[PDB]
Amino acid sequence: ARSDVNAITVLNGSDFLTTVKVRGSNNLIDSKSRILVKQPISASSFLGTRISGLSQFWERYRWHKAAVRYVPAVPNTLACQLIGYIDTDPLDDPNVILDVDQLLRQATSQVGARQWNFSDTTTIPLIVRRDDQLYYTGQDKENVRFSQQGVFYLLQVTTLLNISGEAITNDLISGSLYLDWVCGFSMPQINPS
């Protein structure tokens, strides 16, 4: 009962991430205002969830096949495109970019990217690397490539509009993000908090 073995506990689940908020007209005045979400996809990036709670009890992890899932809380009469991707490089930051088309193009350039209307649902996969690398669970520290396996950027391509030509201006909620994940944690521990 005192086994000193280190074994990967591959285990599945699903978790509620966040309610996304498309920006509208008032707040959306520049390009970086079109980045609705900047959410690391490290196991321990979602405090109240189950994945993060488990992560807290291990050193490491590796998404074997993760996926972000968008569920719309709006009707179809509203129309606005969204582009979502997961940069495997936690440091690559598009916030510095000024041109909107440049940002959407460097988004669509990523391999696991998707586009969709905020009235339907899709799935944003995570493309896992090839060098068997593991990542740490604790709160992000000196460097981020040790901890984060990816960073999910959610983008606003169009302007939020409704039944009529009316352009909404109140920055209202469009849907909800869900993570359908599978990862294996290696070394039992407790991470501080």
Partner: peptide
């Protein structure tokens, strides 16, 4: 039995909202 005197043809086409891609 003059065939095809005044023939007419009907063909529908659904018009849904928000055809998504």
């Amino acid at each position: 039995t003059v065939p095809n005197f005044n023939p007419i043809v009907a063909k529908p086409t659904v018009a849904p909202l928000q055809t998504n891609i």
